Design a protein around this nucleic acid. Structure first.
Ligand SMILES: [K+]
Ligand SMILES: [K+]
Ligand SMILES: [K+]
Ligand SMILES: [K+]
Ligand SMILES: [Mg+2]
Ligand SMILES: [Mg+2]
Ligand SMILES: [Mg+2]
Ligand SMILES: [Mg+2]
Ligand SMILES: [Mg+2]
Ligand SMILES: [Mg+2]
Ligand SMILES: [Mg+2]
Ligand SMILES: [Mg+2]
Ligand SMILES: [Mg+2]
Lengths: 102, 75
RNA sequence: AAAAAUGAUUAA
RNA sequence: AGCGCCGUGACGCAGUAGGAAGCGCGCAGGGCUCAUAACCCUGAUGUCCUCGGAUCGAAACCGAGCGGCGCUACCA
RNA sequence: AGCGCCGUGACGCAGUGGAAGCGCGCAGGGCUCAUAACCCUGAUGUCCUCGGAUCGAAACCGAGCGGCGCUACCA
RNA sequence: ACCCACUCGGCACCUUACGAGAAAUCAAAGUCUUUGGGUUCUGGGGGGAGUAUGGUCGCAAGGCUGAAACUUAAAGGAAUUGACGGAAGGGCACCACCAGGAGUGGAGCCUGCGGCUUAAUUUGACCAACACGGGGAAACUCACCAGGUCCAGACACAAUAAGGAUUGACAGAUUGAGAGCUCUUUCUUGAUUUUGUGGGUGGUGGUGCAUGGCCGUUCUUAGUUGGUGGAGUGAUUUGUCUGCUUAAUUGCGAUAACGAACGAGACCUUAACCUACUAAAUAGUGGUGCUAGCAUUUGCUGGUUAUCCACUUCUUAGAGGGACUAUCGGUUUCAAGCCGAUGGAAGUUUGAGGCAAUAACAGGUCUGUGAUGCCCUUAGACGUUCUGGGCCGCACGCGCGCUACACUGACGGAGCCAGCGAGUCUAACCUUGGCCGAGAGGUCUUGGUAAUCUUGUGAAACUCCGUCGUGCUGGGGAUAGAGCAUUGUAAUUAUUGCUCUUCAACGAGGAAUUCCUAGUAAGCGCAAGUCAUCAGCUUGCGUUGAUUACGUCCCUGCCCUUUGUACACAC
């Protein structure tokens, strides 16, 4: 076919090297979301108060409705199951399902 | 595939030729007036060297020729 | 019944 | 006739305000092709019109010649 | 002789004292057997030079360069 | 006004040509080399050119009449076969689309190509090149570059040829080198040879556009050919087909064709089904029949073809059987067939393959071939070996891929499961087990020439239980630093493995584009090929196992028929 001249090949290579990274996407980022992994007194009172009347209890709903990390959600959830104010339905790792007691 | 010619950057070196000396009966055996003869050449120690081995002479060493051995004269 | 141009020379 | 200009490979064009020349066609040789053409690479090709001057050094500055360009050329 | 205007990307041209833009051209990818068209993307400028005023000039001032012009009438 | 029979004249039709024609065709285009009814006009290869000039007519536009110079090997007619059509009809395909799935194109890295660079960065290939040459190259391979050797210059002729014709050489320069290659002095063998002229032998030299063979493609479709007969002057055609049907030129059939051949089918391999035969410590199971270890009103294991016996269900391989769309209900030019249901292991030819026609491509390969013509080269070799380097080189562009962007996840502990393989005695192959080591590994034995051993390849994805917590985060693991090992003579330009450290882009990717219809897609690993070492590749194997569609010709193409053509180098 048509061979390009050396100057044209150099121009193309230099253009490719100078070229910026054309990311072909719209990059939208959500804002910083923090959850108090450390459990202070006010958050514990909020737990002991409003965790009852919750129709559905799980790590995700504890995270969404209360700014606590998944680790604190899991340990506090098992603590509430020990206190017996929530009864289980399906017991399984990676997914917990809990409702009101009695 | 078009090829170039092998141009050489060095002088050609000569294949060696055996040196031509017409002295092969002169410097080996000598005849006394009576006729008694004892070879002046030495003998290779190794049995597989031959009685007529005719160890050569150099400036500082002795060369065998067959067994490629090296000796000294003041041993 | 939308639009659709082009394709070097020679070689039974 | 005057006043400005210009002349750089075989052909055109680029220098610049002095430290020796670039580009494009053409030529030749390569790469591709059955072989070409186009294309690509490389090389060659300019004693910068001639002569003279100033300069350490001129294709660039100054003078002459040659050739071409442009403008000007009683008077009532 | 006197006077006026122009010079910006390869080309033709805009341009508000806060670093320059339109159209083509060019470049990369795609589609096509291939080129064009087409689609998706990029890049290109001592703003004729050299100094000055301004914090900062493409614009203002001074020169220098190259083009375009205008007046050129009464005798 | 209709009907029947006629008749003259007219516009025309249908059949066949007896005849004519180059044919298309023609009741005239017949009565024509068997050439003559009368008469008018026109043509003489294609262009120049219906042009120039003159004349004539016209208001003009232009008309009528009308050359030559020059130029050229065809231009043209009719028909045949193919090819093509933004032509028609009928079928068809996930290398086409529809409904979708998974992607690729974006990122990092691996690999191949181009280009740059280079001493060389060897080279072929541009749907049908680009993880292709089984091409994952440290030496070799190797074909490239910088150099050093050797002839493996058979044979014929001639010349040298009594120390010759010729080698080999330890030591010192010398060369990267312990190559006497070149030399520095002189020893060994002895018509094996040296030299030149013919010739021959080699060449990963060139030419695949000189060729063979092979392969790929046309072309995954259903197509292809002759004998005799028919049609045609002929090239050619019919057979070989309008309809229906099939995946099929598969059939039902129609029929100037009849009977035939290749391909398709049939065939062979392979996954399924066989409580039916043959059997088996190299496949098994069971009797616990022999002892027992554990728990205890009976289960799980250890030693079982000399510590025995029985049986082939699981397993294997021999001979077979089994499916033929069986039966039934529908539908049909009621024929080929097709759609449902019932049985059956199996009802898209049951699935998947192997083989696979005529004709061709200037397709690829001379670098697979002691396959090969011709050309070139042949001692300072384009021969062949040795050392080193290169093939990997990086401003860049592209094609296969691997790993990812995470919670349907990562990490940690545990549960715990395949099938295909392969593997040493002309020597170190597959490795149990024991011990040391964090690991990679190291050491001592064992078994296996193999349904016996590695090995139940205890693979991974997967499942459970915990840590993380939507933060480029503990996702990702690029780049880079330091050390420890294995292969190999040789690891630097890092073979690879292991440990610690660094922890980059990457937030699901523009235009665009690939593959696929059921045990399929996809996910997941394993084995084998190359292998001394090296998988991100390929060839297979199993594991987990979707969605969507049973369609159409819209796009991209294929087959048949009709048609048009100024194409045949074939749009
Ligand atoms: K495609
Ligand atoms: K194909
Ligand atoms: K992927
Ligand atoms: K070598
Ligand atoms: Mg053409
Ligand atoms: Mg004529
Ligand atoms: Mg090599
Ligand atoms: Mg060929
Ligand atoms: Mg036929
Ligand atoms: Mg390579
Ligand atoms: Mg991190
Ligand atoms: Mg491979
Ligand atoms: Mg065309």
């Amino acid at each position: 076919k048509q061979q390009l001249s050396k100057a044209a090949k150099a121009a193309a290579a230099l253009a490719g090297g100078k070229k910026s990274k054309k990311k072909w996407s719209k990059k939208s980022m959500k804002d910083r979301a923090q959850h108090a992994v450390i459990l202070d007194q006010e958050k514990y009172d909020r737990i002991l108060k409003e965790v009852p009347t919750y129709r559905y209890v799980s790590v995700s709903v504890l995270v969404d409705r209360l700014k606590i990390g998944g680790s604190l959600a899991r340990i506090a959830l098992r603590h509430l199951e020990k206190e017996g104010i929530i009864k289980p339905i399906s017991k399984h790792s990676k997914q917990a399902i809990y409702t009101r007691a009695t | 595939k078009k090829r170039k010619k092998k141009v050489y950057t060095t002088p050609k070196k000569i294949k060696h030729k055996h040196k031509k000396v017409k002295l092969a009966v002169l410097s080996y055996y000598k005849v006394d007036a009576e006729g008694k003869v004892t070879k002046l050449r030495r003998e290779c120690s190794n049995p597989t060297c031959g009685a007529g081995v005719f160890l050569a002479n150099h400036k500082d060493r002795l060369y065998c020729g067959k067994c490629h051995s090296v000796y000294k004269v003041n041993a």
